[PDB]
Amino acid sequence: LANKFSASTVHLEHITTALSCLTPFGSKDDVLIFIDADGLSFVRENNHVIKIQLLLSRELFMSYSYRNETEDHMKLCVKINHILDSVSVMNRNSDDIVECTLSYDGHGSPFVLIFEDSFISERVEYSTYLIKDFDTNGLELDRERISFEAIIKGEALHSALKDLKEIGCKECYVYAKTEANDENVFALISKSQLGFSKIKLPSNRSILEKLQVFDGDSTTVIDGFAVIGFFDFTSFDKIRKSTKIASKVLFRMDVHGVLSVNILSPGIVIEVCMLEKESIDEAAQTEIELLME
């Protein structure tokens, strides 16, 4: 095509899945679209405290053309409510839709979404907006100062998130500890109306594939030390939709209080970065210690 970027596919599950994953970040706000030869990424940020990035790779599209030469990537911003409404009306007859193509022609042009059916094609153009000065790359995991890492199965994490949500969890604490004889302890401690509750993942290579505590440098493994991360549930719960489709989840917390969740569902890959609370109260610390001991 004559467009700078044009990607067409026959699977409509990827688009709706990505939109559903992005929904928990606000039904009426902005979404950033990054376009490059590797693929197309959707980025959202909330309150400068949490960030989500969902990547659709080149393999997911039956055809993918990126003819831009001056710039190696293209950045645009759209309103999520517009896309949500347009797709909801256009996707009412989900059985008949056969092709879906995205297109873009550089700055100053709309983002074009076309649903192609057997004999009817629907074309919608989304207006673009200036990108806010805030840089989404600011909230990133310092890969040289990982406090701990863990690999978890998607279903168990999704069940834990559902349990936390249903009890009206208000504060969450991620507790990670390692010992000898391959003893691992990964737990989520919730402060809610019920008081203090705990959800502990088993130390087996089917729900907790691996767990490591690196003493805040990613190199030296230390046993007997416990890493505790304090988060507000309003931001922690925003990964529930992503975990619903997730096949594997990788938690990585650094010393700067940044937690990164890598969700793997050819596929959809999601990155969620969140900041930790300023500090933990004495009562919360005492309750957590009593729960874990």
Partner: protein
């Protein structure tokens, strides 16, 4: 980093709180006795109400402060549902405390609570007064509904005197090893107008700015309270003097006309020397000028005309 002096030197104990000596002594008596009743603490900003209530709770509950105190303020959710669930569950909690000690529910800025929540608090206080006690903190005691006031002992804090402000300022200076002069401390106290939070903020700003707290150095950053300037302007016996004050001391310093007229109304409300007829006529003229300003004509000419009319009223 280093905390600002206002938060760094917040008292931890009742003994370090100055001003309202009788009230603080009563609070210390309650703290050392234990039988704390429902209480309301009212007063102007920055005089130690929050500090006093928190210190009293800490001293009363000792190690049990974490599990025996429930603190809520205007920045938290405090609707009727909160009263129905969180406060109710806290008051129902069975906590073993030393004899004469009770759980404390601190409601800072209680005046802002909604009517429904305040009405709901009545039954909670009636049912759980045996093991729970409420400490309301507010600026306007009348903003708490009468049924709640009926159960509480009232405690009104007065504005701090220059002596107590000077004493605590000297303590802070001794702790910080700050070089100063007497005139500088007098200027700081004069500008504070009885608000100690402002006094400490201005002291820190002056110490940073020049290191030595002099009157000239204090007045370089901190300005004299504009209400006193407005009072001097209004009480001037000559129209020329009033106009000169309005120009040099208020208009040329960037004070907005709306602020000037509002301050003029507030000051005129408390002019004891003037007669009642003159006072009400001045209030009428100030109100007319305020109405003109609100329409968009916020000019120096309107303020000058208001001053001229006030002077006519005086004659």
């Amino acid at each position: 980093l280093q905390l600002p002096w206002v938060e760094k030197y917040r008292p931890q104990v009742l003994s370090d709180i100055v001003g309202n000596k009788e009230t603080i002594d009563r609070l210390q008596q309650i703290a050392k006795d234990g039988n704390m009743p429902h209480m309301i603490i009212s007063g102007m900003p920055g005089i130690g109400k929050t500090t006093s209530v928190h210190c009293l709770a800490h001293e009363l509950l000792g190690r049990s402060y974490a599990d025996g105190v429930l603190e809520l303020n205007a920045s938290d959710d405090r609707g009727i549902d909160v009263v129905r669930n969180q406060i109710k569950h806290f008051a129902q909690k069975k906590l073993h405390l030393p004899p004469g000690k009770h759980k404390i529910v601190i409601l800072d800025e209680a005046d802002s609570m909604t009517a429904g929540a305040q009405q709901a608090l009545r039954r909670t206080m009636e049912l759980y007064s045996n093991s729970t006690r409420f400490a309301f903190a507010c600026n306007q005691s009348n903003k708490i509904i009468e049924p709640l006031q009926s159960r509480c002992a009232i405690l009104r804090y007065s504005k701090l005197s220059d002596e107590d402000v000077l004493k605590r300022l000297l303590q802070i200076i001794k702790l910080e090893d700050v070089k100063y002069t007497n005139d500088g401390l007098e200027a700081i106290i004069f500008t504070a107008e009885g608000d100690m939070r402002q006094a400490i903020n201005n002291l820190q700003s002056t110490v940073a700015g020049h290191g030595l707290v002099n009157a000239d150095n204090v007045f370089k950053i901190v300005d004299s309270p504009h209400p006193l300037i407005v009072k001097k302007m209004l009480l001037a016996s000559n129209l020329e003097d009033s106009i000169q004050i309005l120009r040099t001391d208020l208009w040329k310093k960037g004070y907005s006309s709306i602020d000037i007229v509002t301050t003029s109304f507030r000051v005129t409300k408390n002019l004891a020397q003037v007669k009642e007829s003159v006072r009400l006529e001045m209030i009428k003229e100030i109100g007319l000028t305020h109405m003109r300003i609100l329409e968009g004509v916020g000019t120096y000419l309107q303020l000058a005309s208001m001053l001229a009319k006030i002077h006519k009223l005086n004659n």
